[PDB]
Design a binder for this molecule. Structure first.
Ligand SMILES: Nc1ncnc2c1ncn2[C@@H]1O[C@H](COP(=O)(O)OP(=O)(O)OP(=O)(O)O)[C@@H](O)[C@H]1O
Ligand SMILES: Nc1ncnc2c1ncn2[C@@H]1O[C@H](COP(=O)(O)OP(=O)(O)O)[C@@H](O)[C@H]1O
Ligand SMILES: Nc1ncnc2c1ncn2[C@@H]1O[C@H](COP(=O)(O)OP(=O)(O)O)[C@@H](O)[C@H]1O
Ligand SMILES: Nc1ncnc2c1ncn2[C@@H]1O[C@H](COP(=O)(O)OP(=O)(O)O)[C@@H](O)[C@H]1O
Ligand SMILES: [Mg+2]
Lengths: 1411, 454
């Protein structure tokens, strides 16, 4: 329970609905309650809901809240009758409007043409258009407190209508009295002047049509066009818009009159005059609002006198007039108009223009936007009588498509019948006879909707005439030639260029070019130069290199025409920040011109082309050029959720909590310090273009420039606040944002490989803290670009795991070389120049080796060593300075017999020391490290060894899956974020990095490595990281999810190959010595067993490849398993002999290697006999057949070879006891089952032994596993089959841990149903357990109680718990018919394959089936 | 083998599948009702009954293919080998896949048909010399115990009037209830309930318009019930469209399926348009009836040309009665508002060929051909030949509406349509229609070869 006072403190304590009502009431009391007398019926409803709200503030109370919501909805429904424009607004918007004193910005939604209301002393005097045009009422409406909201809204709407009528009548009276248009244009609104000019034009053409003359009125309208064109430049902005939008209509008049004059016959002229729209006026009717009607092709429509302002006016073309006449013919019989064709043909604009020409504001719908807004808008339009244009109607969802098609069919039926009332939204709504419905299409209309409409197809309109008259509007001398040239260029651009998905060259991009040419033509002057420069600045940023070549060639072909201070500023900014080219200069100028002309851009190109460098250097050049103080923000979009990015409001309480972008916009809009007068603020969104993330700023990117927030707030975007998007590709992007936002395309790299090598070194020295200058000169002279370019080009021939370009690994090379040279600083003052040169060259050689050859095989590494040396293999530098070898650093280790079973013990070979030293070198360089290789090769092992034996780094234990790391990191770091230790750094061990599925966490790692920090989600603040590094290990190309180069580019990639035969022989020789210290009398045989083991391993690797069966994968982990099995056999056996030892080795090798085989077993028997004969020629070896090698401890106290008869008699007795005590199955007992159960028992006795069984159905794998489990005393658990799987796994772990219960878990293939279960068991089987699956604190305290009954830091506690849960848990996976996709995914999964032992029971043979 | 051929028919289109119980019922209908012996007479009766039962579920191409495949299957087992070689040779010549003179009494007439390039006559050779029976709509409805019928047809072709004629001939009342809105759905539900509880025929137009009703309501209606109540002369009908979205397959399997073909009689559809027009308006009969006559002719030549997909048009368009209505109201308006009787036929020509009849059209050549047809029809000259057989005089200034209506009806009635109505009347070259017939023959014969090779 919280504290109530409207405002609620500590809300995180039916309650959801209650606090939703609380938030709605907070808004209601803040707007109406605390502006109230403007709604008396709503005031009575407010009082009733106040009584109910004070009553509640529980089933009756919830019913009262639902009744209050229904009462508010019914109050809006009553506000429909008496007003019907709130349907453009939501419920909360309608409430805040009925809450015009200090309220605005919502009239654009309901009217569509007005922006603000002009007031004077609590009285309405006029409205202001969106484009700034000023409207003056005929009579000022006096506003009083007691007038209702709907009442003054209605009187304002009627006053607007009557004022437009009055101004039109006055304009027509002035025009008929000989006053020219350039005198009346400065008084009244554009709509009235437009209607008067249109009516006067119609009357004059009709009057001169009765006889045959046209040249008089043609010359008159030409002179009027010239007068308007002369007056345009000497006018204000609103007057400029008025003169432009009237001069386009005067060009239309001149076009019509010129077409009429050229007609040979009067019948042809009458035809063409019937084809053109006509504007008449009736002088008999007393009703003022219907005094003007519409004539087109004989049919008649009526004017409605609605305010339009000065919207963008379509240029009049013959296709436009044909569409107008088609809509006229459809609407005459009360039908609707349907349009279809290719995209970018002007369907929505011709519908908008047809509505605009009749003086009615159409309502335009866009589709991608649910059913409720569609139904509400349709009801509002049918009540008002407006018109409601369904854009991308084919793109709507099928269910809402059927619903809105039924609604449109009902509307058309009402229009055909002429019904007074329409039944829509289960209510009898008044149906005006002035309504209309229009649909535009790109498939076709549904047939039930097709039958009631008129489908009309348009092509691309006469873009030549459109461009000509647009150029004529702005005042170009030769509009027609330039228009023909530019439309020809756009056609050739759409024809010749590549079919890239963002190459759009329709009419919209041409209109954008013409729009953007205006400041450029003011700055440079009219002609071909201004249009070619606008064309360059619009089209060049989005083209590729060959696209740029075609663009340049064609532009030079057709067009005749072919600021040094800003160049100097870019050069100075690049020199100051350390960046460093013709391509870089071209991209800098392109971005400069876009940021001069466009307010929003997207940055895209190949990874590491210099996009961040480009925009950072242009922003610094803007700082030094314009003098503006520059602040820059870089945001990674996908690391945070969209709700966290744009302001997280909990839907439970509907309470607004600010986001980081929301906080940035609030700081921008508030402007507390006032520095914004000369400040341009930049937020760069550096991640891929998610349509869901980017569509929240659709109004921001467009001309609206207003941010739409979920709570209804509207924070403006100033012109100096520009948004950038850094991405890699345009795969998941709609063409709407592509044409809407400027696109800068980095086709290839900027080269500058000589210039690149200096920035890395300079920032390396800048990141640090007489000899410094000398070492800098030595490094710079050693970095000879002539040899380095050849080495880099030759480096591409090697195979690279996680293939990253050579231009993107130079960071690792330079950082490592600089760190290595800086590490030897104190031993530089007492040595000659030649030895310094040799040492520096050798260190650079090592850094280049480990950068350009890390991700290659050992053979490829040696090949690159040889080639680079011709341009040693294990060269090193030891503590004067001298050249030495890696081989001399190998130590010697002598472990105990029981120390073999510990997995954390490695044996230091040459490659182990080499990998550990370079891992230290790269870690101390503060660079990310990724090690790749086949499973079992020793990546995780070498990282744990390098991290445990060092006094400079600590270990964080994090486990990954398909679906965090920072959660455990919060318990090891201190808040800037610092490591808890003041000496050792902290490094992030992130294992199984391929496991997350596409990805947020990989981009979080990229954010931590690149920008060296992250944004705190609940606090919306930037924290910088000081001493945390990131490492990982996977093999991407062999995984049955490739990563973005933008992440792996910031990390060093090294390949970790399999140990050689000699290395394996040495390490397992030491293992054999350790286990043979138990039986010292046979210590002289250590070498033959080791050589036999490694030879058998490589033979099994070469023979039984994965190309035969999927699970035929052999890795040196099997050898460790074999040695551990041999140790467990020796330690739990009697005094053995040489024959006993060789038979034990043969049995264990057979069990480890051959148990995956189903002929193959005979081949393995032959191989075992061959290896025994070749390597161990001992007397009476034998015991290599399947039935000749039976080892078990089921008969006595120790492990030894057994005879068949006693074993089978004992197992029959135990099985009859099992049948008498456990479930009874009529099982026939045969030799293969005895062999299988022997191997299962020898697998189950091993600590942390997990297993999975492959075989055909009804082979008996589960029943034999259950029998051996009962025989071996384990506790059986059967999954009674995500929440259930999680709880049964938690129950198994808790029962195993808190009660010390040794469990055998039998998981069948039928149990798994989704990939989440597979991921859960993959996590559980990868390490010992999955702790992720107040409960955590309860488990921790029970863990402490158990530990004290049976260690202070959480690390040792966690390790002890892991060892306990590993020792007492075994899991068995029963899987059958591996041809199944789910079964194949389970087997081939890397997490479950490595830990479990693979058992192929296979199908029955002839002999076993015989007995 | 014939069941395999019918399954391969069902493989081509969604509407052409068959069940097995229907096939067994058709087989037992052979015996429930001498070719040199008794067993061969049984086999002949089996083939004839099966063909007449399964021929009306197909269009002209599939039923003609089925007829010729069944004839080949009969002849290839009873007749000798040289007959099979000659048949495959002539079929390969028909599909332009094989060349060679056949090895030569009925086959002489077949060769005469083939060398004359009269391919539909070659199909009639099969259908007449072998089969001696054909089934119409009345034969289908009379010879079936089912109560559901699906009568599909191509767009711009409807056979509702055929079912009305059948119901009038059956002395049974037909209820025509179109769909398209939720009110229409409620009306259909209450009407079908009233029919199922009391009786009387119900016919639903375009249930594909209510394909949502198909998957949810109709599926729960017809599949979740047995045979309906055995009322006297009480049945339920349904119609659909072949060219659109597929309906639910089990609903097809649970009903007898009929495909209705077109009626492209140009004079017949002029008569159908003229006889259904109740002439009334501000302009009684001085020019409105003449303009309606010209518009009926124009709609006839434009709705018959759309049947020839690759030659008459460049794409299968669909013109319907709404286009006729809007053209009629435009003609009424231009005639009413221009009483000087110097009627601007250019306005009518342009408004028909750009907005009224040129709206749904996309290609330029099809706009050109519609403009050509409208210019030929709406030329407005003193004497015009709407077809090479009929000449239409303009109305004189001394008649009423009744005299002019009777005169135009008499001009319509005495006309006899020639056999080349699709060629001579639509102003098309005979070479183009011959090439279209050749392409149809090649498609049919290639489908037959593909059927017979498996
Ligand atoms: N003149 C230059 N030529 C080439 N590269 C340069 C130059 N100057 C600096 N660089 C380096 O090029 C790098 C290019 O990084 P870039 O921003 O293009 O990478 P990205 O992965 O595509 O994107 P982001 O880093 O924004 O996520 C810069 O980080 C900088 O260190
Ligand atoms: N008279 C005109 N003058 C200039 N541009 C036009 C004109 N008519 C149409 N357009 C162009 O047509 C585009 C409208 O695209 P449209 O074909 O309506 O696509 P959609 O139907 O998906 O909205 C506009 O961007 C505009 O540039
Ligand atoms: N040089 C080596 N010395 C000892 N053991 C090694 C060596 N190289 C690889 N191994 C074996 O490789 C296995 C580790 O491989 P890997 O799967 O990468 O690590 P983990 O098993 O910890 O996930 C260990 O079981 C170890 O026995
Ligand atoms: N010796 C045997 N070998 C194979 N199947 C047997 C044997 N004895 C009994 N069965 C049958 O096998 C069934 C148990 O097999 P089970 O292991 O559950 O199959 P799966 O191997 O597919 O899991 C019993 O119901 C029994 O009928
Ligand atoms: Mg591991």
């Amino acid at each position: 329970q919280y504290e109530v006072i409207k405002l609620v403190r500590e809300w995180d304590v039916i309650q959801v609905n209650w606090v939703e009502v609380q938030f709605y009431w907070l808004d209601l009391y803040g707007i109406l309650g605390e502006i109230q007398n403007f709604l008396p019926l709503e005031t009575s409803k407010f009082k009733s809901l106040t009584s109910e709200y004070k009553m509640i503030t529980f089933d009756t109370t919830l019913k009262l809240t639902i009744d209050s919501l229904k009462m508010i909805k019914s109050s809006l429904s009553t506000f429909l009758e008496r007003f019907p424009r709130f349907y453009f607004l939501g419920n909360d918007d309608l409430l805040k409007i009925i809450g015009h004193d200090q309220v605005s910005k919502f009239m654009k939604k309901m009217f569509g043409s007005i922006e603000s209301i002009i007031f004077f002393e609590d009285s309405i005097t006029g409205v202001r258009s969106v484009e700034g045009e000023v409207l003056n009422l005929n009579e000022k409406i006096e506003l009083k407190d007691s007038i209702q909201a709907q009442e003054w809204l209605n009187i304002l709407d009627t006053e607007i209508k009557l004022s437009v009528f009055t101004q039109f009548r006055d304009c027509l009276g002035q025009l008929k009295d000989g006053t020219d248009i350039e005198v009346v244009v400065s008084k009244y609104i554009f709509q009235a002047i437009l209607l008067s000019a249109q009516v006067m034009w119609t009357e004059l053409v009709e009057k001169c049509l009765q006889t045959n003359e046209f040249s008089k009125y043609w010359k008159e309208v030409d002179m009027k066009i010239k007068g308007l064109l002369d007056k345009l430049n000497k006018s204000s902005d609103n007057v400029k818009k008025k003169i432009e939008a009237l001069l386009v209509e005067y060009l239309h008049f001149n076009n019509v009159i010129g077409q009429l004059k050229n007609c040979s016959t009067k019948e042809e002229a009458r035809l063409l005059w019937a084809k053109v729209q006509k504007f008449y006026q009736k002088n008999d009717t007393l009703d003022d609002l219907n005094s003007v009607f519409i004539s087109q092709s004989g049919y008649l429509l009526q004017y409605k006198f609605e305010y339009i302002g000065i919207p963008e006016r379509l240029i009049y073309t013959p296709l436009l007039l044909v569409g107008f006449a088609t809509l006229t013919d459809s609407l005459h019989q009360k039908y609707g108009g349907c349009f279809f064709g290719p995209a970018g043909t002007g369907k929505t604009e011709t519908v908008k223009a047809f509505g605009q020409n009749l003086g009615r504001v159409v309502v335009v719908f866009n589709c991608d936007f649910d059913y409720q807004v569609l139904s509400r808008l349709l009801v509002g339009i049918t009540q008002i009588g407006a018109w409601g244009c369904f854009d991308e109607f084919n793109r709507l969802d099928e269910k809402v498509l059927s619903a809105v098609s039924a609604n449109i069919q009902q509307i058309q039926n009402g229009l055909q019948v002429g019904k007074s009332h329409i039944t829509l939204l289960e209510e009898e709504t008044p149906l005006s006879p002035h309504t209309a419905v229009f649909i535009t299409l790109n498939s076709e209309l549904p047939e039930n909707l097709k039958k009631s409409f008129r489908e009309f197809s348009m092509k691309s309109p006469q873009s030549g005439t459109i461009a000509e008259m647009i150029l004529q509007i702005m005042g170009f001398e030769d509009s027609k030639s330039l228009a023909s040239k530019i439309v020809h260029f756009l056609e050739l651009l759409s024809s010749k260029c590549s079919s890239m998905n963002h190459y759009h060259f329709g009419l919209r991009t041409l209109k954008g070019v013409l729009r953007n040419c205006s400041p450029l033509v003011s700055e440079f002057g009219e002609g071909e130069k201004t249009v070619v420069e606008s064309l360059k600045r619009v089209i060049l940023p989005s083209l590729g290199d060959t696209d740029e070549l075609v663009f340049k060639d064609e532009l030079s072909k057709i067009f005749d025409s072919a600021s040094k201070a800003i160049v100097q500023c870019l050069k100075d900014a690049g020199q100051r920040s350390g960046f460093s080219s013709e391509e870089f200069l071209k991209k800098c100028m392109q971005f400069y011109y876009m940021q001069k002309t466009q307010q929003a851009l997207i940055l895209v190109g190949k990874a590491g082309c210099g996009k961040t460098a480009t925009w950072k250097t242009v922003i610094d050049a803007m700082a030094i050029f314009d003098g503006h103080a520059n602040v820059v923000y870089v945001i990674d979009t996908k690391v945070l959720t969209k709700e966290s990015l744009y302001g997280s409001m909990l839907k439970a309480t509907l309470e607004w909590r600010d986001g980081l972008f929301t906080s940035i916009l609030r700081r921008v809009n508030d402007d507390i310090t006032g520095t914004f007068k000369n400040s341009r603020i930049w937020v760069v969104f550096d991640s891929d273009l998610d349509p869901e993330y980017v569509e929240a700023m659709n109004s921001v990117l467009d001309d609206n420039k207003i941010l739409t927030l979920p709570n209804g707030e509207r924070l403006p975007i100033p012109p100096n606040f520009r948004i950038l998007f850094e991405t890699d590709n345009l795969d998941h992007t709609t063409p709407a944002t592509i044409t809407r936002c400027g696109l800068l395309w980095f086709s290839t790299d900027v080269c500058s490989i000589s210039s690149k090598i200096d920035h890395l070194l300079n920032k390396s020295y800048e990141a640090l803290d007489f000899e410094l200058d000398k070492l800098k000169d030595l490094i710079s002279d050693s970095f000879d670009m002539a040899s380095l370019t050849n080495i880099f080009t030759c480096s591409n021939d090697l195979v690279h795991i996680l293939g990253v370009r050579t231009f993107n690994k130079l960071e690792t090379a330079v950082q490592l070389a600089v760190h290595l040279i800086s590490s030897y600083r104190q031993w530089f003052q007492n040595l000659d120049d030649k030895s310094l040169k040799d040492v520096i060259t050798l260190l650079i050689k090592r850094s280049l080796l480990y950068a350009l050859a890390g991700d290659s095989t050992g053979e490829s590494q040696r090949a690159f060593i040889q080639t680079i040396n011709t341009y040693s293999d294990y060269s090193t530098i030891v503590i004067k300075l001298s050249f030495s070898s890696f081989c001399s650093e190998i130590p010697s280790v002598s472990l105990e017999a029981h120390e073999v079973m510990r997995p954390d013990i490695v044996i230091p070979t040459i490659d182990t020391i080499k990998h550990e030293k370079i891992f230290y070198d790269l870690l101390n360089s503060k660079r990310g490290i990724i090690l790749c290789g086949p499973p079992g090769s020793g990546k995780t092992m070498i990282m744990n060894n390098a991290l445990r034996n060092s006094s400079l780094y600590d270990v964080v234990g994090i486990n990954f899956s398909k679906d965090h790391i920072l959660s455990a990191l919060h318990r090891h770091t201190n808040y800037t974020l610092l490591p808890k230790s003041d000496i050792k750094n902290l490094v992030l061990f992130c294992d199984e990095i391929n496991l997350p599925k596409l990805q947020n966490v990989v981009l979080f790692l990229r954010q931590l490595m690149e920008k060296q920090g992250f944004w705190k989600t609940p606090e919306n603040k930037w924290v910088t990281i000081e001493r945390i590094h990131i490492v990982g290990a996977c093999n991407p190309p062999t995984d049955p999810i490739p990563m973005s180069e933008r992440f792996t580019r910031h990390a060093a990639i090294l390949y970790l190959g399999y140990p050689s035969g000699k290395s394996l022989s040495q390490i397992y020789e030491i293992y054999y010595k350790a286990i043979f210290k138990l039986v010292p009398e046979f210590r002289s045989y250590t070498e033959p067993f080791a050589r036999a083991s490694v030879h058998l391993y490589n033979e099994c690797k070469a023979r039984y490849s994965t190309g035969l069966q999927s699970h035929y994968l052999f890795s040196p982990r099997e050898l460790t398993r074999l040695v551990r099995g041999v140790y467990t056999a020796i330690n739990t056996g009697p005094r053995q002999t040489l024959r006993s030892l060789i038979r034990l080795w043969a049995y264990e090798a057979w069990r480890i290697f051959a148990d995956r085989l189903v002929k193959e077993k005979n081949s393995f028997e032959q191989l075992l006999y061959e290896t025994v004969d070749k390597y161990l020629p001992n007397q009476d070896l034998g015991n290599i057949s399947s039935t000749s090698l039976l080892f078990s401890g089921l008969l006595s106290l120790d492990f030894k070879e057994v005879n068949k008869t006693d074993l089978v008699n004992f197992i029959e007795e135990r099985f009859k006891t099992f049948c008498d005590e456990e479930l009874e199955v009529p099982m026939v007992i045969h030799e293969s089952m005895v062999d299988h159960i022997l191997r299962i028992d020898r697998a189950l006795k091993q600590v942390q032994g997990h297993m999975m069984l492959i075989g055909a159905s009804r082979t008996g794998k589960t029943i034999l596993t259950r029998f051996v489990a009962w025989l071996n005393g384990l506790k059986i658990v059967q999954p009674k089959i995500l929440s259930d799987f999680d709880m049964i796994l938690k129950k198994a772990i808790s029962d195993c841990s808190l009660k010390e219960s040794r469990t055998c878990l039998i998981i069948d293939e039928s149990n798994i149903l989704e990939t989440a279960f597979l991921e859960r068991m993959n996590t559980l089987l990868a390490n010992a357990d999955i702790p992720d699956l107040e409960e955590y604190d309860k488990l921790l305290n029970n863990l402490r109680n158990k530990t004290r009954s049976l260690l202070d830091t959480e690390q040792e506690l966690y390790d002890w718990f892991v060892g306990e849960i590993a020792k007492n848990l075994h899991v068995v996976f029963t899987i059958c018919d591996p041809t199944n996709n789910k079964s194949s995914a389970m087997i081939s999964s890397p997490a479950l394959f490595n830990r479990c032992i693979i058992n192929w029971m296979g199908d029955w043979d002839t002999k076993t089936m015989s007995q | 083998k014939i069941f395999s051929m019918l399954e391969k028919f069902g493989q081509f289109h969604w509407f052409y599948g068959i069940s097995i119980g229907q096939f067994l019922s058709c087989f037992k209908r052979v015996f429930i009702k001498a070719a040199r012996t008794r067993v061969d007479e049984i086999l002949w009766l089996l083939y004839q009954e099966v063909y007449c039962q399964f021929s009306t579920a197909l269009d002209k191409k599939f039923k003609m293919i089925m007829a010729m495949t069944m004839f080949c299957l009969y002849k290839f087992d009873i007749e000798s080998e040289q007959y099979k070689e000659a048949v495959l040779t002539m079929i390969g010549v028909l599909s332009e896949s094989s060349d060679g003179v056949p090895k030569l009494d009925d086959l002489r007439y077949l060769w005469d048909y083939v060398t004359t390039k009269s391919y539909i006559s070659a199909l009639n050779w099969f259908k007449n010399e072998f089969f001696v029976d054909e089934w119409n709509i009345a034969d289908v409805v009379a010879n079936s115990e089912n109560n559901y019928f699906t009568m599909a047809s191509e767009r711009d072709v409807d056979g509702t009037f055929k079912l009305i004629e059948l119901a009038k001939a059956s002395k049974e009342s037909l209820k025509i209830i179109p769909l398209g809105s939720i009110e229409n759905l409620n009306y259909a539900q209450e009407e079908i309930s009233k029919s199922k509880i009391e009786g009387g025929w119900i016919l639903l137009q375009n249930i594909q318009m209510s394909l949502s009703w198909v998957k949810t309501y109709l599926h729960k209606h017809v599949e979740e019930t047995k045979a309906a109540e055995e009322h006297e002369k009480f049945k339920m009908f349904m119609t659909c469209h072949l060219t659109g979205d597929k309906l639910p397959a089990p609903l097809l399997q649970r009903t007898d399926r009929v495909v209705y073909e077109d009626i492209p009689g140009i004079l017949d559809t002029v008569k159908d348009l003229w006889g259904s027009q109740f002439f009334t308006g501000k302009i009684s009969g001085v020019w409105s009836v003449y303009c309606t006559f010209l518009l009926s002719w124009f709609h006839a030549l434009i709705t018959a040309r759309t049947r020839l997909v690759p030659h008459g048009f460049s794409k299968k368009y669909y013109f319907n009665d709404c286009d006729f209505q809007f053209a009629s109201v435009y003609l009424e308006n231009v005639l009413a508002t221009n009483s000087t009787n110097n009627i601007p036929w250019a306005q009518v020509r342009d408004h028909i060929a750009t907005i009224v009849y040129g709206g749904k059209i996309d290609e330029e050549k099809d706009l050109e051909v519609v403009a050509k047809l409208c210019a030929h029809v709406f030329c407005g000259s003193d004497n015009l030949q709407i077809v090479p057989g009929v000449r239409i005089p303009q109305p004189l200034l001394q008649q009423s509406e009744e005299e002019e209506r009777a005169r135009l009806t008499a001009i319509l009635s005495n006309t006899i349509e020639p056999a080349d109505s699709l060629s001579s009347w639509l102003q098309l070259p005979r070479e183009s229609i011959l090439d279209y017939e050749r392409l149809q023959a090649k498609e049919v014969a290639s489908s037959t070869e593909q059927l017979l090779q498996e």
